[PDB]
Amino acid sequence: YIPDDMELIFHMDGNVNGHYFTIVATGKAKPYEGKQNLKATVTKGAPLPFSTDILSTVMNRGIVHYPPGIPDYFKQSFPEGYSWERTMAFEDGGFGTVSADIKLKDNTFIHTSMFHGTNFPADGPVMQRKTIQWEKSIEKMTVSDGIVKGDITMFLLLEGGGKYRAQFHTSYKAKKVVEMPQSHYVEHSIERTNDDGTQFELNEHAVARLNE
């Protein structure tokens, strides 16, 4: 169901601080190597008047290198696929909620999402677009209520050398019964490039481990 090379299609509807936008994107993945990239176009509400980095993690835990011996919930969910919901907290009281649906068709993941971010200070690093890159992070994966949950403590590097702290909780729901993983970790390396506020690129590598 999940071949070695895949195409990616994205649609995102969102709102940050009352500014509405839409993003389309296309890209490619090698799911077993935990690699993916995309290029995105803002088709409504461009240029984005906030940090792209608050939505880069919106645009698939199926694209993770899983070694033998940890059950892969995400890859096993296909063909039915899976959805997820995320709560995002930030140190200055900004917050956001995300819903995403991942469908598999014709060696493509079709990823549709809705993102609401609010309560970001007008003069803060998000609304002033002063963020650089997320630091590499470690998502702790646990099982409760028959589903998978992920928790991340995250740091967004800022222009001038500070950090803007975040904490992300995600609930991941398979559309069928699958073998459940033990507690494990997913290491995430995400980069944003070529961002002019109307188009931008992203890439990620993600690997699952049993310890840290």
Please give the single-letter amino acid code of residue 182.
Q
Q: Closest by alpha carbon to 101, among 5, 10, 28?
A: 10
Positive/negative CA dihedral, 54, 132, 119, 88: positive
Number of CB atoms found within 10 A of residue 50's CB: 24
Number of CB atoms found within 10 A of residue 177's CB: 9
Ranges of each domain in the chain: 6-209
| SS3 state of residue 84 | strand
Positive/negative CA dihedral, 14, 17, 20, 26: negative
Please give the single-letter amino acid code of residue 156.
L
Q: Closest by alpha carbon to 29, among 21, 37, 39?
A: 37
C-beta pairs of 106-110 under 8 Å, 24+ apart in sequence:
106/7, 107/3, 107/5, 107/6, 107/7, 108/6, 108/7, 108/8, 108/9, 109/6, 109/7, 109/8, 109/9, 109/29, 109/60, 109/62, 110/9
Alpha helices by DSSP H, listed for 15-65, are none
Q: Are 125 and 117 in contact (CB under 8 A)?
A: no
Q: How was this structure determined?
A: X-ray
CATH 3.30.460.30 holds for 6-209: no
